[PDB]
């Protein structure tokens, strides 16, 4: 039945000192699954490598670097944050690894490589310990290579900057191994992975009169297989699927996915809670999952009028919408992810809770990412929230400062990474 999730690892400070710069803002596995990268608010990217001797090894620190630095836009006299918005791994070209890291304005291509040898031997001097007198040398010696302890290097290969007027919210690589897209609030640009001085603006929904603004782009993503298909979601709860074969500019959407507005549950907040914060293509590519504030919707790419599935993440927050609006919690941008076989979907919630939904069995579980269970191979108890029986949690006792916004699934195994405000938890199943 349900997967027996167990505590495996925790990475971060043992205290509650968030420091506001160590807060994780993105979690991502690579294509093989052995590497796990996290970016934080301070602009740092940390890569953990699975211990290789199916594979249930632990993750240890593999690399660390400063992806982005704080900047100042003199052109607008505004502080440009170094917070890492998205990290996307590229398919493995050679022995090195590559990723794309984006802040609000700039995308960077980073190469992570291992070096295990160094040059040895000198002509005009010794090994930097002393210099040699001129004319003393009468025999050339070409430097040789000698092994050294393995050390990991991270270097920025290409910078894609100054192309987005607004804050970038999405980057997505194309299946052709050649291009990718970056999407800010109102425009989607297409980049070539080896060209930094120009980009192709494929989508532009900026109105002529800015006081007539009604929609913004909240997420965008390429199809996992099809090289011509991509989707982008908006703050109105609609997803536009664009085909790049029809025309050079994708201003005319091929498909429009939107559910009819239910007049039953109308409220003052129905416009805010209907905004889509994340859209993810299934691994098979035949389904599409969108996350709004209160629910997770699964759409068949052949049916546009309604989703095929709808799961309610946290229904007990429906009566507490005003309170969540007062403290700006209603504007949180949660995420969602599929499993390897597109059968289970995982998303986050409040009070360090994350939700698993099984599509085959229609069973949902709530689990807690807490350090109080800091014992490896310990089964996580399911959690229940009461609107108070035994082992239940009252709604008014939930901590809304503890949000699980970023989660990742291992592309092949049953390993999940869950980012709380300051710690990163890695959970495995009972194997």
């Amino acid at each position: 039945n349900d997967i027996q999730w167990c505590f495996s690892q925790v990475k971060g400070a043992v205290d509650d000192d968030v420091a506001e710069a160590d807060i994780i803002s993105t979690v991502e596995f690579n294509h093989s699954g052995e590497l796990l990268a996290t970016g934080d608010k301070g602009g740092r990217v940390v890569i953990f490598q699975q211990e290789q001797e199916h594979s249930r090894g632990e993750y240890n620190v593999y690399s660390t670097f400063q992806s982005h630095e704080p900047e100042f836009d003199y052109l607008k006299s505004l502080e440009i944050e170094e917070k890492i918005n998205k990290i996307r791994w590229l398919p493995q070209k050679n022995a090195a690894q590559f990723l794309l890291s984006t802040n609000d304005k700039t995308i960077k291509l980073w190469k992570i490589s291992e070096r295990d040898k160094r040059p040895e031997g000198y002509n005009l001097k010794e090994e930097d310990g002393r210099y040699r007198d001129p004319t003393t040398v009468t025999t050339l010696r070409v430097p040789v290579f000698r092994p050294m302890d393995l050390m990991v290097e991270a270097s920025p290969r290409r910078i894609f900057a100054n192309a987005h007027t607004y804050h970038i919210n999405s980057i997505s690589i194309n299946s052709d191994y050649e291009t990718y897209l970056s999407a800010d609030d109102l425009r989607i640009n297409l980049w070539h992975l080896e060209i930094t001085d120009r980009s192709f603006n494929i989508v532009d929904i900026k109105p002529a009169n800015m006081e007539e603004l009604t929609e913004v782009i909240t997420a965008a993503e390429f199809h996992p297989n099809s090289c011509n298909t991509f989707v982008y979601s908006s703050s109105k709860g609609t997803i536009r699927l664009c085909d790049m074969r029809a025309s050079a500019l994708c201003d005319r959407h091929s498909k429009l996915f939107e559910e009819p507005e239910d007049p039953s549950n109308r409220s003052f907040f129905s416009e805010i809670i209907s905004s889509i914060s994340d859209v993810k293509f299934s691994h098979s590519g035949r389904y599409m999952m969108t996350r709004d504030y209160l629910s997770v919707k699964i759409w068949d790419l052949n049916m546009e009028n309604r989703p095929v599935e709808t799961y309610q993440v946290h229904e007990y927050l429906r009566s507490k919408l005003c309170s969540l609006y007062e403290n700006d919690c209603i504007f949180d941008k949660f995420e969602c992810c599929w499993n390897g076989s597109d059968s289970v979907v995982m998303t986050g919630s409040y009070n360090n809770f994350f939700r698993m939904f099984d599509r085959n069995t229609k069973r949902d579980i709530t689990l807690e990412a807490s350090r109080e269970n800091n014992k490896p191979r310990t089964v996580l108890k399911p959690r229940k929230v009461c609107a108070r029986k035994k082992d239940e949690i009252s709604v008014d006792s939930l901590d809304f400062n503890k949000k699980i916004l970023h989660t990742a699934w291992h592309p092949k195994e049953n390993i999940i990474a869950v980012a709380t405000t300051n710690n990163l938890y890695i959970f495995q199943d009972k194997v």
Partner: peptide, 13 residues
Amino acid sequence: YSAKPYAHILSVP
């Protein structure tokens, strides 16, 4: 809603 999360889009120096 066009004020709290929007902000920077509508805000122009």
